[PDB]
Subunit: 484 residues, 4 copies
Amino acid sequence: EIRKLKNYINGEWVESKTDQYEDVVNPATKEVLCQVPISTKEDIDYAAQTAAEAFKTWSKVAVPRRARILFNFQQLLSQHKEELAHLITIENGKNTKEALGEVGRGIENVEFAAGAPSLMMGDSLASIATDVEAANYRYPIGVVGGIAPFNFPMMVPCWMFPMAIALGNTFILKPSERTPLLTEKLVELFEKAGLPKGVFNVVYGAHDVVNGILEHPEIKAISFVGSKPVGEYVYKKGSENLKRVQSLTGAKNHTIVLNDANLEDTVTNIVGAAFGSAGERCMACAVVTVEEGIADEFMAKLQEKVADIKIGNGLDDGVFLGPVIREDNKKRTLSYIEKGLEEGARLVCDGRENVSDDGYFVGPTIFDNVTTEMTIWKDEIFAPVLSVIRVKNLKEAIEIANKSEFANGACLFTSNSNAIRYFRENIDAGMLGINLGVPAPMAFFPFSGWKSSFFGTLHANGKDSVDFYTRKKVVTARYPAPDF
Amino acid sequence: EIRKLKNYINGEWVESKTDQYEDVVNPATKEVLCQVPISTKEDIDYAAQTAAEAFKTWSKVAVPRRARILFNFQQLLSQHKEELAHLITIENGKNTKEALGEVGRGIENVEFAAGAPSLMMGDSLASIATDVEAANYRYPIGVVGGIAPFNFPMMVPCWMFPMAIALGNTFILKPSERTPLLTEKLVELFEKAGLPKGVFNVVYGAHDVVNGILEHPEIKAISFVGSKPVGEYVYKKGSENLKRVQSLTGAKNHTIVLNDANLEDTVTNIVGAAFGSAGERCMACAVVTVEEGIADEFMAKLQEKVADIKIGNGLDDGVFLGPVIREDNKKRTLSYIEKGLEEGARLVCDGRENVSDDGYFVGPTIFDNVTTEMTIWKDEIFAPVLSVIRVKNLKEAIEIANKSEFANGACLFTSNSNAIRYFRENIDAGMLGINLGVPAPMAFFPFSGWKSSFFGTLHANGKDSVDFYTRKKVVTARYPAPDF
Amino acid sequence: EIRKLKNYINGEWVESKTDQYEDVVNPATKEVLCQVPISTKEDIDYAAQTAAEAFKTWSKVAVPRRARILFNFQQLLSQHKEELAHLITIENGKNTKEALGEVGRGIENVEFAAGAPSLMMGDSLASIATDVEAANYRYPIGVVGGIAPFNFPMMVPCWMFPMAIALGNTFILKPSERTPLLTEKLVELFEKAGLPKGVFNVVYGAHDVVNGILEHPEIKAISFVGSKPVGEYVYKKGSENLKRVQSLTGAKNHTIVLNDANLEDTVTNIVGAAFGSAGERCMACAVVTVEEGIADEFMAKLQEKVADIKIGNGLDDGVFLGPVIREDNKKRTLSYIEKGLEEGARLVCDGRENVSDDGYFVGPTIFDNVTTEMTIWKDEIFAPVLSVIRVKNLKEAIEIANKSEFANGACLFTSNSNAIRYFRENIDAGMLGINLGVPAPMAFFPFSGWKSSFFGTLHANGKDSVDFYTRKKVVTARYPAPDF
Amino acid sequence: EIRKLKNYINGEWVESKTDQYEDVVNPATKEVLCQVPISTKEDIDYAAQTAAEAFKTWSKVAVPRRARILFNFQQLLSQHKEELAHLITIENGKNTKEALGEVGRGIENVEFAAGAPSLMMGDSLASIATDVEAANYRYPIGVVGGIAPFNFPMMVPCWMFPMAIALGNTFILKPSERTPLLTEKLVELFEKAGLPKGVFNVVYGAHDVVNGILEHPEIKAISFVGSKPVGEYVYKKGSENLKRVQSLTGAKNHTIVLNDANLEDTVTNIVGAAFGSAGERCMACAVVTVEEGIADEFMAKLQEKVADIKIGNGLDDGVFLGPVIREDNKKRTLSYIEKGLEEGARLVCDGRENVSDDGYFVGPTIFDNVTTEMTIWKDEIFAPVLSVIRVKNLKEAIEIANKSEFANGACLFTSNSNAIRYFRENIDAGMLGINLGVPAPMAFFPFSGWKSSFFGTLHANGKDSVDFYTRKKVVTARYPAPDF
Ligand SMILES: NC(=O)c1ccc[n+]([C@@H]2O[C@H](COP(=O)([O-])OP(=O)(O)OC[C@H]3O[C@@H](n4cnc5c(N)ncnc54)[C@H](O)[C@@H]3O)[C@@H](O)[C@H]2O)c1
Ligand SMILES: NC(=O)c1ccc[n+]([C@@H]2O[C@H](COP(=O)([O-])OP(=O)(O)OC[C@H]3O[C@@H](n4cnc5c(N)ncnc54)[C@H](O)[C@@H]3O)[C@@H](O)[C@H]2O)c1
């Protein structure tokens, strides 16, 4: 009665040779949507052998023709916005608006990758010496592996396979065993777009699959997006196996609010960056360092706004806050709230109260008087928990943000040019936002995090993704002028 | 009965204020398809005003949004390939195979342009001095004027308006008076794609409209694609009016055939480059300099292949060669064929014979023993008339081609590395082709012509079109580190 | 007694075949320094033919070898800063501090140009179609013509010949007949740097030489930097002759001082921009639009600082304001002050009072209460005359600057990010400065002006200069995979 | 008295705290040139602390100024080519001609690095959404560690520290313990060029120092150039320590000779690429796959010139082949020759005979009838030992070359464009040479190796080095237009 998902390998949906399956539920109602197979390394090998085979011909299809397919894909995605958004909500929990928002950014990724022909151009010189010319070209590297998180069932995957495939590589994706349904739709639409068999492969699962991706010698590159501990493991293991990898990991993003900040706009951006998507965002505002002069009014206006948050099913309109992903995560959050109180942090808003039990719901929570000594500051909670800290000025704010081991993003609310430059010059984070709650850059820019937030050389998206998914060859040739 | 075409201004089809209309006939059957208005300056003035007005809002639409529309446009264009090709054949005459080929390249222009976000990116430096940062940006210039020829009813217009619009400008297109229908379809499809009013304007006509575009102060840039005389004039008048302009003009492309050439491939290619589309292409092969050693065998296969060429209505299966555009062009050609004989050229193949009269037909013709002193060599016949010349070696071939006033394209059929380099380094033409009949570079490359074939600095297409349709603003800022 | 200057053609100093000569004096003492020949179209023909000949070998010296000579040049220049600055002061007037400043900028140009190898790189693709590859390359165009002004005897020329030479072209420079000594030194040092004969030619003179440059078919490109009337003239004439040209012309740069401006820095910056180098600068501040609130305090501080300006001989340390270039410019300036008083403007500082007669000295003068209807606002005084206007806000300020036909540079003094963005998006000028008196961008950025300040497509410096001094050839080739 | 070299930390030569010193001998005379310290952890710790401290001010020095110093450095280096070449020759063994060549290459690296300003430029967009702009910037990462091999005492180091320092980083270089003298001069010359203290540091030593670079937290990036085994270890340990690393390792470059090859040019190029610098070159030709047709004639010609090779002291004129680096290398090579004969290879040229004993000399050796199953083909001998293989066609040669574990460079001697494209499209090596023995690409191109020849994503040199020694921060800002 509960549909068992199948893997997509070499052009068709095949069943896994596994006896292990996992229930994927709707975070808001605990209803079982389907069953996800915990594929075996046996499935990963077949998928790898397949991708390596399809690579031989796909890589020979000229980039202009491949780009064409990305255009088709781009259009099919747009036509299915309502469906994709629906799948993201019932599976991830975020409401329709935020879900619809994810679909849009994932499409932007396809749009950016559709311009692959120009993105692949190498350098060329007519003469570097008498009768000698030189030019280098870009080539795909073979089969690429991708590992996706549950917080973005569509967007993160779109960061990887559209661009990698457009550049000539074949792909093996391991979506999040918690949010697999969306990827199933991507496959369908990418097949409709005209993508040939074995070019885009999907193997559902967990650890076995991951290790198979790390261990298989056919998979020359790895793009991992997820938690710090797992991403750090993937980076090391992958390097041990002598293959390039990029791991976009955890975050503990800080937002700096200065005295001259426009409170109206600020409070709204912050409430959304901290509580939207149940705070399950690598770009979620985890800590706010507000300047003394505006601190009092900020907390007053922050509480007011936070009091109007409707908690419920992401499908219902009026709903702002959905549920955390799993039961396990709800407990970890309540534990963190408990930990905060124990460490001396002051509860300004308690999300442990007035929450439905229909789903894994947790109301917004905000702590006051927190320090860099506390666990709720050092750890990425990844739930509706915002910590607030009063600072003397921009300098102290940055010292606190920089003290965090994570450096994904940071925000600054102000209209002061000098404050902005200083912020950008001394802040450790790599994805900065001025007067914006979520500092996530658009697809044509690399998603540049730093420190414990990023392991590797080249980030995802932007021209970085292009170079990470290709390798270069340089040709220096001597062609002596003929005699007549 | 006969539909009268209308102008497209401010998002709507409007009757020209003119009382003069021009019949648009099918070159292959002499029948009237419709009438195009010979619009007045009053019309061009209104278009400029509304285009200048639309520019105020359209330029304020972020490039990612404008680009999304180009993706829709790209799709609509693909779902109408057949209709578009049909239309091109009807008013131009080329068979549906070549027509289908033109529409594909026009779509490629849109595809290239859809990547406007990255193409527009300027340069940014965090510190050029202590406390000082600097960066430059690209902005649209305003209203762009475009004037297109008849040999490419879709492609040429697509080199212009999609990019200029994507980059943020508003456009006024004056298509060829002889092939107006295609442009009508573009307008309609771009409207369905979602382009707001006043951004894409079309004013049909001739001189009054062209001079209107050249004189009107609101039209900042002019893209002209046509004959050398007209283009030389547009460049000069445009420049006198102090506006930037690019004139892609006439050609007399030369094809070099060396002894090691692959006869089979070479002949098929040259036959296509010289007689496809009735030789009415800026990239058409006009002169061929064959190396002495392979000349005899070359001529044998060429004439053998030319004998298989079937002439007729482009819509009919089996038809290779179609009609020339107007009755006046048929006469000009027959006159050239005469001057050839009159100058000593040996008419090896006569195209004045076995030519139906249902349309303006002219069979493929080829002259022998032609020299650089003949009008047959110095002028662009722009019809199905090929001239051949026996040369001693690559060097003499290049000297002959370089002697030509034009320098649009040139081809070399060989497998010798040294010849190829020597060729590229010494030939004057900017668009080179090795073992290909038509050296037309793809959209993402600038259409680099030279000499009397190009007047200006930046060519059409490629990144050249990005800078031509855009201007820069650089900002050097000093933001002292605040006092703490 | 008075040394006559020669021209530098084909690596040799040859005397001009002219009877007419010109006195070149020291603006500060009327002391005659030497005699400049008003060369004839005969001299230019010699230069052009010489430059075209040498272009055959120079364009064949691989760019890496050419760049090496630029490095040597860069060093020689650096070793002669004192000498070069001495010449600039002696013939132009500006003090040694500003003169030293000019040599530094001129060396930056040489440094940027020394990176020509990477700047010339074109685009390459291994496969655009099965078995087909495509790449484009840049090549010099031939002999380039440079026409420089008197306000930057060293820098402006350095915007031209260094980059043009490095890219493969040969050069014919026509420095200002008013400041020709500096060029004499640049020629020597470039010769010592290792530059071969005929690559860098210098022809002193005026109209005859200009028209020779414009009319000679051998001179394929013209870079002009001077007044608007002449530039507008050279742009048209050059275009009539069908050659690419770029004219960087006159300016009436506006500076906006908002209420949050740091007056300390603002005043000092404006004083130096308005009166430095006798206001004889294309980046000089001719108009200040001050916000009403801080207007009075600004005027008291500006008036105070300006009255302290020391006028004298540029070599003399302690001297801020030097002399105006000629005697006419002195009279014309006096005439402008007189015009201002007549038009209703109010004097705050009378430049007519207390001024030596040893040289063409004019004290700094400042008007207030001027309007967009006064000749004092419409014309480029190009002398130490500064007009200020009180405005309600940033919006009114921008409207005023935008009303000028000139749009070279514009500056804004504020710390408000919203004001800064608004300024950049709506201002017409192309060279903007935030909290800087002179918005002159560094050599690696195009020197982008707009409207009556620039004529053409590509500006001087930056990658713009690279494209302006080169042309491209795209090569699309088909090399079928052999059978074995 | 033998001179003891010191370390260079904080702009000062300071004695190592170690008591372990290593003799540096002239490979050609066995004479002890000096003693190099085997530094301790304290020493690297000290350098790391110093470098990190200097980084705080060096990174704040705008790139245009930092580049100025690179121009000085470039000049100083050029005015010491002799002294530099001499040091290379007595320290490494290569004749002064090849030494002078290395000096030039190294100087090119500095020439390329001097263009840091433009190379560092990021992307900037005026509007990505209404009232929202975005742009990213490049910043140095901190302290960079470099480890160089003995075969290029100057060039390899110049691939690293010059660019790193120009990009704003600080550097800690560990040169080869066998060729420390060259580095000493680079340090001294860079100091004279004006480099501030702590920016360029040198710590001589072996394992303690290397492991210090790997383990120290202040060293964010590591550049390793050496053998596959050591490099593989550096990559893994480095990655394990969460720092980015690039390992340029061993090679077994093949050179393909087709029937249409030019024996004269080919043979010369191959003799130089196989026996130049005693074959101790990552770009040296280790295997030649000759086409049957020309095989015999090739071998005969190769014999002639190989026999004309003069062996001796690098400083002596007429000397072509110098000594191998050390005794072990001589023994390892002799041992390889033994294994060759032992495996079935025909010793066509024995370099064990007629070899002086003044230094570690080994005459040119060439094997025949070698196979993919032989040790002499699978291992990098890194000495003057050539292996030849007769193959039927290009395809088989590529299959053999691709079978090698290495893929640094590959050469192809032909004039057939079809073979050339096939070669580039199917060969595994990343640095290809057409009609050139040493396919080493110029500094402005990334030194792109592959397979077991490179570990990481970004190679050394080119724009790859710019991205490897740098990190990005993107800034998306919302600045609402103010209200007027
Ligand atoms: N290099 C290129 O990119 C390119 C591409 C296509 C065609 N062409 C050239 O175009 C020509 C064929 O096209 P065509 O016959 O339509 O060219 P044309 O110059 O006769 O007409 C082209 C445009 O110019 C306008 N025009 C013609 N005469 C005019 C006049 N006296 N005053 C003002 N406007 C005038 C027309 O209305 C038309 O829109 C050939 O010479 C061909 O080589 C060049
Ligand atoms: N925007 C820029 O890049 C820039 C930089 C420097 C100076 N300028 C402008 O230059 C002007 C000051 O320089 P200037 O006084 O030497 O300018 P100018 O126009 O008088 O002379 C500049 C060059 O033009 C030539 N020239 C002058 N009149 C001519 C005529 N009638 N016919 C032919 N050639 C003629 C001169 O010999 C000189 O080499 C100012 O208007 C200033 O704004 C612009």
